[PDB]
Symmetry: C5
Subunit: 238 residues, 5 copies
């Protein structure tokens, strides 16, 4: 049950941590690599009490990245401790740590001021699938966005939501509030079985006025496939 | 036959993947390097059922890049699997993965709203040559482009098309729709025997109004020569 | 006592120095690594006469960074000597020097020209806690900022102060005057037990007019946990 | 004779290729390094039928660069083959490939529409010296430049030419048309015995209106001394 | 005597060359390192006829840099030859060459058009001290700056000079004209015993109108301590 709570409640920290495997990892015998895989698996299980970790194969879809973790935790200290432990494991020691981003899941700022019919649609349940594609786009707003008053921003977000609703059927979403914890304002996360829909979703959004206030849109756009840890690591132990 | 379908149909994913060879690859004896070349060849043939892979020599033409693949696949998960397997082969283990870009081949958005005479010319068959030069330019449009209405954009694309038609005789083209799959909106790909013509084509297009809406033009501009995999890898096995 | 003087007086240089550990550090036997940890410890104690050094675990919270020092000194030459010595120790030789930033603690330029009631609040003592989160944001102002007259800038800083006072309860702060000693105008430093409050503080400040004059805001935003040196280094000696 | 044709005719490709020598090159015994020098020398001679290669010592004058080649070829394929071969030689294998740029020598676009007296001066023969300094500045024009009509651009280039004529006495020049082959529009190349004159030339040019249309000016500005290959490589074989 | 002439006359080239020491330098035994130090010292003395070289400890004050040389020479060829020789010594072979910049010392452009009382002050002798701090800021002016007419620029530089004169007492200065020799227009160099004064000097200058025409200001800002070569290298031979 508590797994659900970290994935849906407000006040939960979400961290996105990317990694790439050193060339010299293959110089290890295959035996060593499988023992190393074992260690990592154990570490994750030991932390399963305090935090939830999900894995993604970025290798072959995202540039300069093999593995990503999405870690949910009630305090970032625990995430620190886990990631430090992880990077210390023998597998971890052969990993070049890529990007790292943090944000807190929060209660919605503009949605209360939307129409009632638009609130119903947002409550509708979309993509419920295993092994979907996963996308992460960090976002930074311009100065102009903050200078706007609440009514203006609420209007712009309503246009945003309107453009995107049709795609809630096949695309799942989650928003993290990132300001002050790194160099972006939000982290956006998505799961979909249909990449061409996701493409059309992003295209629809590029046409709303709100879009021009995204001072940073991507860089990087992370694309991968959701997968259990064992399957990912197994690739490397062969 | 099916080869043609991947290269021409809509809904096919095209991935562009560049690589550079580690200094330490030459520390291997020449025998090891020829065995490794054999591995890679086999892997490509094994995947020949599900995806089409084409190779280009970037070495000596594109900075910080030796090899590029253009991979066509009906699903990006298969491209992932292939590239992951590839990067794992002995040869793959000595390659530093450069850029990686994806886009879907789609049905034309503005071409129906062009004049009939302009539609005839666009259907005309241009460069049919082996071992041609190949160019890849990623493109990102500005906010202002999306804010325009459909009629304005159609107008601007018609100007684009009119500027470029004369060059269809000696330059082949293909457009991939990239938004949401990485940090660019389109990936453009070109084959030509005459680089001087391609130069004059890009020069003609810098003069149309549409051009100023390319927030990102190149970076990198990839230039190479199309070539069978065996020839390219054989260079490295000597 | 004199520890306090360095952390509170004007004319004290604060230097911020980030580091990341080489992959090849783990090729050393665990014995060697414990020896090396000993060395660094000693060097820090030796310099404890002249300068104060504080340590932060960036590992797992800040991208491409494992350790940060905040060094206080009355002359930057001493900081130079200490950092140079540190980088020479065996542990130091396996560290890739990340960013480096300096600024001087100075007497306040605008605060005399604020209201009396606003001066009371600024004097009030906030976060007094061990092992808190620590954030560093380097800042560069635009040309327009400097072109403003004193009255205008004072007005804008009063707005900044007003927005931020409520957060003095749970967030500690320190300002360093960096201009001329590197490529930023200010280094901002913060300690907090409550990241969510820090987030809301930076969000409140993004809405004051002063904010649009930050030509550089972050890049990098350094996030970590304050910790004694032996705990941090101990992680690496295992 | 044919050497002249490549350096003066239109339709000749000029490639600019920079390299830096790996630290571990000195770990080779001095014998090995002289044998390697021999290899490279021979390769250049073997290609002397199809292409012209000239060498420059960038070491000590241009940052992060030791050697530059200026290669002239009637087809870029041949330059590819040569540079690939070169990078493969033992000396080549210890070189980190810096930048790489291409452009075609072309017949002048605006000079026919200049006054007759200004055409006379442009025909006059300037710097005829061995071992001169060499400068390469890549250039990218802004959108605005292309949007101008021919008459406006011709007018601006006439101002450019006028400002720079006095310096034709001591500064030799050549222009390569680079658009579409990489990320710059032009490659500018210069030889001079008098760097202070070159300085004053570039100063004179920063004052003409055309200058503000250079979206990219330099980055890098390459400075070196022209020298035969054997002299340059000899430095490294010691 | 002639030492003065290089440091004061017009037409002398000044080159700024920064270096960082390889990790693997400390794998050498301490004997080898002191022999290496001897080599470099000798080379400098051998070139003492033709050029003047001054050293700065950048380690611990400037990021990614240990050593800087300021070389004065009547011709840049001689600087090239020296720096090449230097990089070739055993010490030199374990150095990663950082930035490199050149400029010529020239007669003042605007000073003749200043008031007489302002000319008197500029003649006054300021900081005469051994082992001072040294700062280098490269500067590139915007297009706008060049488009101004002489009278406008002279006006702006008089404001610049007025702002700065009070600091001539404690800060020594030198200007190198860099355009065409690299990617910047000027190289500014400063010596001071009082960094806090230098800070206030740069702050006073950020408020004059001229300052908004500095398209590039720093990047890097190099900060170090002036010191004899033997002291600096001795640190490394321990
Ligand atoms: C699946 C379809 C989507 C739906 C139904 C949707 C809905 C919403 C809603 C209701 C909010 C307001 C939250 C609040 O009240 O505070 C929001 C915010 C936001 N959305 Fe979406 N969204 C979708 C897709 C996307 C996409 C594709 C992106 C970018 C890739 C994106 C980026 C953002 C960002 C950055 C915010 C924060 C508010 C802001 O823009 O400043 N969303 N979204
Ligand atoms: C070889 C001759 C060329 C022809 C005949 C041609 C024609 C066209 C046509 C007809 C379209 C519209 C298709 C649609 O409606 O979706 C188009 C789109 C596009 N083309 Fe070209 N083109 C040529 C060369 C180029 C070149 C050299 C570039 C850039 C290097 C380029 C970049 C683009 C881009 C980025 C689009 C996306 C539509 C947009 O701008 O929003 N094309 N081109
Ligand atoms: C904890 C609540 C905060 C308070 C009470 C506060 C207050 C102040 C005050 C009173 C000054 C004026 C000092 C003077 O006159 O010299 C100042 C300056 C400054 N503050 Fe804050 N601040 C807070 C948080 C922040 C944050 C979160 C940032 C940025 C991340 C920040 C950035 C700056 C900067 C860069 C200056 C430099 C002076 C200038 O703006 O020109 N402060 N702050
Ligand atoms: C040495 C004295 C110089 C002379 C006599 C000179 C003369 C000319 C002439 C006649 C043209 C027009 C050719 C045509 O019709 O296409 C031209 C173009 C050009 N010049 Fe120069 N030039 C000189 C130096 C320089 C320098 C120092 C630079 C920049 C570092 C430079 C940059 C260019 C560029 C980029 C073009 C391409 C045309 C354009 O601006 O679009 N030239 N020059
Ligand atoms: C120590 C106090 C300073 C004094 C007394 C001073 C004075 C001057 C004077 C008299 C000139 C004109 C010389 C000529 O005719 O070329 C000048 C030019 C110049 N100065 Fe300063 N200066 C000082 C500090 C600085 C500083 C701190 C900087 C920036 C870090 C700076 C940057 C420049 C630059 C780039 C020019 C070139 C003209 C231009 O801006 O286009 N100077 N300075």
């Amino acid at each position: 049950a508590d797994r659900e709570k970290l994935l849906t409640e407000s006040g939960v920290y979400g961290t996105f941590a990317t990694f790439q495997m050193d060339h010299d990892w293959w110089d290890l015998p295959g035996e060593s690599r499988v023992i190393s895989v074992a260690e990592v698996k154990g570490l994750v299980e030991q932390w399963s009490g305090k935090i939830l970790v999900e894995s993604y194969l970025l290798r072959g879809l995202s540039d300069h990245a093999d593995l990503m973790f999405r870690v949910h935790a009630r305090t970032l200290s625990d995430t620190q401790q886990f990631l430090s432990a992880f990077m210390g494991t023998r597998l971890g020691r052969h990993l070049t740590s890529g990007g790292l981003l943090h944000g807190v899941s929060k209660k919605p700022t503009y949605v209360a001021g939307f129409p009632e019919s638009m609130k119903t649609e947002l409550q509708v349940n979309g993509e419920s699938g295993s092994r979907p594609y996963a996308i992460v786009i960090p976002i930074k707003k311009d100065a102009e966005w903050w200078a706007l008053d609440q009514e203006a921003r609420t209007a712009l977000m309503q246009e945003h939501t309107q453009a995107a609703l049709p795609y809630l059927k096949t695309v799942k979403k989650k928003l993290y509030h990132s300001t002050g914890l790194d160099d972006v304002d939000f982290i956006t996360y998505f799961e979909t079985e249909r990449l061409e829909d996701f493409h059309n979703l992003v295209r629809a959004l590029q046409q709303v006025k709100e879009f021009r206030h995204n001072r940073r849109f991507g860089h990087p756009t992370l694309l991968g496939t959701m997968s259990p840890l064992d399957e990912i690591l197994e690739k490397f132990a062969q």
